[PDB]
Enzyme design. Structure first.
Site, PDB file in Angstrom:
ATOM      1  N   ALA A   1      46.551 145.808   4.796  1.00 14.09           N
ATOM      2  CA  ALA A   1      47.537 144.756   4.893  1.00 14.09           C
ATOM      3  C   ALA A   1      48.907 145.403   4.829  1.00 14.09           C
ATOM      4  O   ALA A   1      49.507 145.521   3.761  1.00 14.09           O
ATOM      5  CB  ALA A   1      47.349 143.773   3.773  1.00 14.09           C
TER       6      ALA A   1
ATOM      7  N   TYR B   1      51.378 141.831   7.733  1.00 13.48           N
ATOM      8  CA  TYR B   1      49.980 141.402   7.573  1.00 13.48           C
ATOM      9  C   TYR B   1      49.599 141.137   6.121  1.00 13.48           C
ATOM     10  O   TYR B   1      48.517 140.591   5.863  1.00 13.48           O
ATOM     11  CB  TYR B   1      49.006 142.387   8.218  1.00 13.48           C
ATOM     12  CG  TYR B   1      48.913 142.278   9.718  1.00 13.48           C
ATOM     13  CD1 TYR B   1      50.030 142.511  10.536  1.00 13.48           C
ATOM     14  CD2 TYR B   1      47.701 142.003  10.335  1.00 13.48           C
ATOM     15  CE1 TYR B   1      49.941 142.413  11.917  1.00 13.48           C
ATOM     16  CE2 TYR B   1      47.603 141.914  11.723  1.00 13.48           C
ATOM     17  CZ  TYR B   1      48.722 142.125  12.508  1.00 13.48           C
ATOM     18  OH  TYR B   1      48.636 142.043  13.887  1.00 13.48           O
TER      19      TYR B   1
ATOM     20  N   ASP C   1      39.124 143.831   9.394  1.00 11.47           N
ATOM     21  CA  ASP C   1      40.481 143.332   9.629  1.00 11.47           C
ATOM     22  C   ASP C   1      40.858 142.255   8.603  1.00 11.47           C
ATOM     23  O   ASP C   1      40.000 141.532   8.083  1.00 11.47           O
ATOM     24  CB  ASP C   1      40.569 142.700  11.029  1.00 11.47           C
ATOM     25  CG  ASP C   1      40.795 143.711  12.146  1.00 11.47           C
ATOM     26  OD1 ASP C   1      40.548 144.909  11.972  1.00 11.47           O
ATOM     27  OD2 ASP C   1      41.236 143.257  13.238  1.00 11.47           O
TER      28      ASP C   1
ATOM     29  N   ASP D   1      43.332 139.827   9.338  1.00 10.40           N
ATOM     30  CA  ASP D   1      43.767 138.643  10.090  1.00 10.40           C
ATOM     31  C   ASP D   1      42.583 137.717  10.375  1.00 10.40           C
ATOM     32  O   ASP D   1      42.371 137.304  11.511  1.00 10.40           O
ATOM     33  CB  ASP D   1      44.523 139.046  11.392  1.00 10.40           C
ATOM     34  CG  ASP D   1      43.689 139.865  12.356  1.00 10.40           C
ATOM     35  OD1 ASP D   1      42.952 140.774  11.932  1.00 10.40           O
ATOM     36  OD2 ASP D   1      43.740 139.661  13.608  1.00 10.40           O
TER      37      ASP D   1
ATOM     38  N   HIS E   1      31.542 142.731  19.745  1.00  9.72           N
ATOM     39  CA  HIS E   1      32.822 142.098  20.046  1.00  9.72           C
ATOM     40  C   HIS E   1      32.569 140.723  20.657  1.00  9.72           C
ATOM     41  O   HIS E   1      31.761 140.595  21.586  1.00  9.72           O
ATOM     42  CB  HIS E   1      33.581 142.976  21.020  1.00  9.72           C
ATOM     43  CG  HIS E   1      35.028 142.662  21.159  1.00  9.72           C
ATOM     44  ND1 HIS E   1      35.491 141.456  21.627  1.00  9.72           N
ATOM     45  CD2 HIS E   1      36.110 143.445  20.988  1.00  9.72           C
ATOM     46  CE1 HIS E   1      36.805 141.495  21.694  1.00  9.72           C
ATOM     47  NE2 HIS E   1      37.203 142.697  21.329  1.00  9.72           N
TER      48      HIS E   1
ATOM     49  N   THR F   1      35.618 147.526  28.004  1.00  8.99           N
ATOM     50  CA  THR F   1      36.911 148.213  27.998  1.00  8.99           C
ATOM     51  C   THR F   1      36.875 149.505  27.181  1.00  8.99           C
ATOM     52  O   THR F   1      37.766 149.778  26.374  1.00  8.99           O
ATOM     53  CB  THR F   1      38.035 147.290  27.507  1.00  8.99           C
ATOM     54  OG1 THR F   1      37.746 146.834  26.179  1.00  8.99           O
ATOM     55  CG2 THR F   1      38.139 146.077  28.389  1.00  8.99           C
TER      56      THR F   1
ATOM     57  N   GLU G   1      39.315 151.561  18.021  1.00  8.70           N
ATOM     58  CA  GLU G   1      38.145 150.877  18.584  1.00  8.70           C
ATOM     59  C   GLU G   1      37.478 151.674  19.695  1.00  8.70           C
ATOM     60  O   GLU G   1      36.241 151.672  19.807  1.00  8.70           O
ATOM     61  CB  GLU G   1      38.528 149.490  19.072  1.00  8.70           C
ATOM     62  CG  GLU G   1      37.452 148.685  19.767  1.00  8.70           C
ATOM     63  CD  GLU G   1      37.894 147.277  19.971  1.00  8.70           C
ATOM     64  OE1 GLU G   1      37.867 146.496  18.999  1.00  8.70           O
ATOM     65  OE2 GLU G   1      38.295 146.938  21.108  1.00  8.70           O
TER      66      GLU G   1
ATOM     67  N   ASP H   1      36.318 134.301  17.361  1.00  5.55           N
ATOM     68  CA  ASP H   1      37.608 133.631  17.496  1.00  5.55           C
ATOM     69  C   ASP H   1      37.346 132.271  18.118  1.00  5.55           C
ATOM     70  O   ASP H   1      37.074 132.194  19.318  1.00  5.55           O
ATOM     71  CB  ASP H   1      38.568 134.470  18.344  1.00  5.55           C
ATOM     72  CG  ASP H   1      39.969 133.852  18.436  1.00  5.55           C
ATOM     73  OD1 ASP H   1      40.073 132.619  18.335  1.00  5.55           O
ATOM     74  OD2 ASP H   1      40.928 134.606  18.649  1.00  5.55           O
TER      75      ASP H   1
HETATM   76  O1  LIG Z   1      51.210 145.654  11.433  1.00  6.15           O
HETATM   77  C1  LIG Z   1      49.976 145.754  11.178  1.00  6.15           C
HETATM   78  C2  LIG Z   1      49.069 145.875  12.215  1.00  6.15           C
HETATM   79  C3  LIG Z   1      47.722 145.975  11.902  1.00  6.15           C
HETATM   80  N1  LIG Z   1      47.289 145.948  10.619  1.00  6.15           N
HETATM   81  C4  LIG Z   1      45.883 146.074  10.221  1.00  6.15           C
HETATM   82  O2  LIG Z   1      45.089 146.501  11.335  1.00  6.15           O
HETATM   83  C5  LIG Z   1      44.127 145.505  11.648  1.00  6.15           C
HETATM   84  C6  LIG Z   1      43.910 145.533  13.158  1.00  6.15           C
HETATM   85  O3  LIG Z   1      45.068 145.068  13.841  1.00  6.15           O
HETATM   86  P1  LIG Z   1      45.080 143.661  14.595  1.00  6.15           P
HETATM   87  O4  LIG Z   1      44.329 142.629  13.802  1.00  6.15           O
HETATM   88  O5  LIG Z   1      46.519 143.367  14.898  1.00  6.15           O
HETATM   89  O6  LIG Z   1      44.389 143.954  16.017  1.00  6.15           O
HETATM   90  P2  LIG Z   1      43.076 143.355  16.771  1.00  6.15           P
HETATM   91  O7  LIG Z   1      42.397 142.278  15.933  1.00  6.15           O
HETATM   92  O8  LIG Z   1      43.492 142.944  18.158  1.00  6.15           O
HETATM   93  O9  LIG Z   1      42.362 144.779  16.761  1.00  6.15           O
HETATM   94  C7  LIG Z   1      42.174 145.531  18.016  1.00  6.15           C
HETATM   95  O10 LIG Z   1      43.397 145.986  18.652  1.00  6.15           O
HETATM   96  C8  LIG Z   1      44.106 147.012  17.935  1.00  6.15           C
HETATM   97  C9  LIG Z   1      45.416 147.330  18.639  1.00  6.15           C
HETATM   98  O11 LIG Z   1      46.316 146.245  18.385  1.00  6.15           O
HETATM   99  C10 LIG Z   1      43.260 148.272  17.823  1.00  6.15           C
HETATM  100  O12 LIG Z   1      43.099 148.824  19.128  1.00  6.15           O
HETATM  101  C11 LIG Z   1      41.917 147.934  17.197  1.00  6.15           C
HETATM  102  O13 LIG Z   1      41.100 149.123  17.232  1.00  6.15           O
HETATM  103  C12 LIG Z   1      41.269 146.762  17.934  1.00  6.15           C
HETATM  104  O14 LIG Z   1      40.026 146.389  17.305  1.00  6.15           O
HETATM  105  C13 LIG Z   1      44.695 144.221  11.059  1.00  6.15           C
HETATM  106  O15 LIG Z   1      43.727 143.208  10.791  1.00  6.15           O
HETATM  107  C14 LIG Z   1      45.288 144.752   9.784  1.00  6.15           C
HETATM  108  O16 LIG Z   1      44.254 144.931   8.807  1.00  6.15           O
HETATM  109  C15 LIG Z   1      48.233 145.834   9.590  1.00  6.15           C
HETATM  110  O17 LIG Z   1      47.828 145.809   8.415  1.00  6.15           O
HETATM  111  N2  LIG Z   1      49.536 145.720   9.905  1.00  6.15           N
HETATM  112 MN   LIG Z   2      42.375 141.645  13.986  1.00  2.13          MN
END
Ligand SMILES: O=c1ccn([C@@H]2O[C@H](COP(=O)(O)OP(=O)(O)O[C@H]3O[C@H](CO)[C@H](O)[C@H](O)[C@H]3O)[C@@H](O)[C@H]2O)c(=O)[nH]1
Ligand SMILES: [Mn+2]
Ligand SMILES: O=c1ccn([C@@H]2O[C@H](COP(=O)(O)OP(=O)(O)O[C@H]3O[C@H](CO)[C@H](O)[C@H](O)[C@H]3O)[C@@H](O)[C@H]2O)c(=O)[nH]1
Ligand SMILES: CCCCCCCCO[C@@H]1O[C@H](CO)[C@H](O)C[C@H]1O[C@@H]1O[C@@H](C)[C@@H](O)[C@@H](O)[C@@H]1O
Ligand SMILES: CCCCCCCCO[C@@H]1O[C@H](CO)[C@H](O)C[C@H]1O[C@@H]1O[C@@H](C)[C@@H](O)[C@@H](O)[C@@H]1O
Ligand SMILES: [Mn+2]
Lengths: 279, 279
Positions: free
Chosen positions: B61, B65, B144, B146, B166, B178, B236, B259
């Site tokens: 976090a 986040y 994650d 979020d 996924h 991808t 990823e 989602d």
């Molecule tokens: O500013 C940030 C950005 C990310 N995170 C952490 O990283 C996790 C992953 O980031 P996102 O949730 O923003 O991204 P996605 O759910 O879209 O995750 C995907 O996209 C990412 C790029 O944005 C990576 O490529 C990752 O491997 C892929 O699973 C977050 O839950 C959070 O735990 C933070 O803590 N702060």
């Molecule tokens: Mn995420």
């Protein structure tokens, strides 16, 4: 430590297409049930060869059952773990009656003499050859000798602990299972318990888990003997009690233990791999 | 050593009745794919409680986040490994922004401060907290932030190594995945390879296997950085390469990473367990 698999080209598994829709392919404790169509043997062969896996196969051939060794071993050479390291352990009261069978490379056979029924197999596997098996093999597979291999039996079976569905009972409800039903026996299983009826003729796992199983069954059989009771199906009754209380990590389908004379060739069996010989 | 399960009364599994006929429930390397209806949670809970299993959950976090932590943790308390020992590890650049969340008994939370993107998660899990995780927990689950838990996420997921399908790609053919497609990247996967597309947002396993995975991914990302290339989906992409070459021992269905705003509630999902929060 497990090294990386090499590049391999094979059909993509598809999440929305089951391998088999006619049978249960996973137990409720998330152990695979091994049927044809559920495994890609090329992937499994890679995984197990990369670990240089050695499989021990124990078989008892006492008194007249030495007659079954030639077909058992010759067909094992055709079908059992081909390409992998195999060590056969033949327990017999007649070492000179063991047939001379030609083995493929990386395969060996040891004749283990025993003295001239009920408790012998579990006792021998658990009390006698403990350090030897731990030093010599990764997995132990324990089978009846009154059998022949007709088709592939390979590394898809290997796992810490497995049993095999008895061919006469795979469609039966648990109250019909021939578990030991007397509460005075260590093998006792009530009518409202039981997952499956496993046959005594094919079980296995890691050396450690097989030694645990056979030790527990031997101790339980000794308690029964002291209490003047013999379980209805002897070591099979105890095996069933053990596998009820210690869930196996794979279950083999009846492809792996079949009697064609008795039961034919049902639609649910795509292969008959290891089958009873008339006696 | 695993002690005996107690007597339990539950429905008999039936060999000629599949749990699910609409989905693949086992991979071609004999790993279960975890869907609702495939597991009896009472059996699994017994097995894992008898081992006094401790589950570590890592979550990052960083920057904005931190806002997601309250819902993440409060819903984890409702749904994640309830009845088992849990240790949350919250990696953050803002320790004072971690919300005060009331935990059930046998559950603890540690705030791990990190300095104020791409390589951080794999590096932190693999280089920084190695001895600590090995001493404190049996399994690590890496997710994650979020996200929110809406339904049961429990010991059915635990295994030496797992990834999660996924939600956008579970019905896709492998050429549409991808994956990183440039041969100059360590994450490269050709169009004729691939089992599944795993999401970076939920993976785990034993501490040893998770440390292996995260170390390998971190090293691969460092090679790419030295060669002036960044994989298309960052960690990823590397996770996918790792799980292609090191097959997971369970695969979680998209029940475990969904989602609903994007993808609705398809018939194939009987439960939505862990779901994206709008951002
Ligand atoms: O500013 C940030 C950005 C990310 N995170 C952490 O990283 C996790 C992953 O980031 P996102 O949730 O923003 O991204 P996605 O759910 O879209 O995750 C995907 O996209 C990412 C790029 O944005 C990576 O490529 C990752 O491997 C892929 O699973 C977050 O839950 C959070 O735990 C933070 O803590 N702060
Ligand atoms: Mn995420
Ligand atoms: O004189 C004998 C009798 C048995 N065996 C060995 O013991 C194995 C099991 O015996 P059988 O093949 O005769 O018996 P089943 O195939 O009917 O086995 C079942 O019935 C047995 C009682 O006959 C036990 O109850 C056992 O647990 C149960 O699976 C044989 O393959 C053989 O390896 C011998 O070597 N010599
Ligand atoms: C005529 C024999 C009919 C036997 C049917 C049931 O099989 C028997 O099941 C017993 C437990 O209830 C125990 O496992 C012995 C088992 O009989 C053996 O296995 C069968 C499949 C046959 O091959 C049979 O000849 C053999 O004795
Ligand atoms: C509008 C967003 C559409 C995204 C659809 C595909 O999901 C994305 O897949 C990428 C790999 O191809 C990568 O994993 C990010 C992933 O997007 C994330 O996950 C989705 C399920 C959404 O929650 C999305 O908002 C999130 O960024
Ligand atoms: Mn027999």
């Amino acid at each position: 430590f497990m090294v990386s698999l090499p590049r391999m080209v094979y059909p993509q598994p598809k999440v929305l297409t089951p391998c088999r829709k006619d049978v249960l392919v996973v137990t409720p404790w998330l152990a695979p049930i091994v049927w044809e169509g559920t495994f890609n043997i090329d992937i499994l062969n890679e995984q197990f060869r990369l670990q240089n896996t050695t499989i021990g196969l124990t078989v008892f051939a006492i008194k007249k059952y030495v007659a079954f060794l030639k077909l058992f071993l010759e067909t094992a050479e055709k079908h059992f773990m081909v390409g992998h390291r195999v060590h056969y352990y033949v327990f017999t009261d007649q070492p000179a009656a063991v047939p001379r069978v030609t083995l493929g490379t990386g395969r060996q056979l040891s004749v283990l003499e025993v003295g001239a029924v009920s408790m012998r197999r579990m006792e021998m596997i658990s009390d006698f050859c403990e350090r030897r098996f731990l030093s010599e093999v990764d997995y132990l597979v324990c089978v009846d000798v009154d059998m022949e291999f007709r088709d592939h039996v390979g590394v898809e079976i290997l796992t810490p602990l497995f049993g095999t569905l008895h061919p006469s009972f795979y469609g039966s409800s648990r109250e019909a299972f021939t578990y030991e039903r007397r509460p005075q026996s260590q093998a006792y299983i009530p009518k409202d318990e039981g997952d499956f009826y496993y046959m005594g003729a094919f079980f296995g796992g890691s050396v450690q888990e097989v030694q645990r199983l056979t030790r527990a069954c031997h101790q339980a059989m000794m308690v029964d003997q002291a209490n003047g009771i013999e379980a209805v199906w002897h070591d099979e009754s105890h095996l069933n009690k053990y596998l009820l209380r210690h869930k196996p990590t794979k279950v083999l389908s009846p492809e792996y233990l079949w009697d064609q004379q008795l039961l034919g060739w049902p639609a649910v069996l795509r292969k008959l791999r290891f089958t009873a010989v008339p006696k």
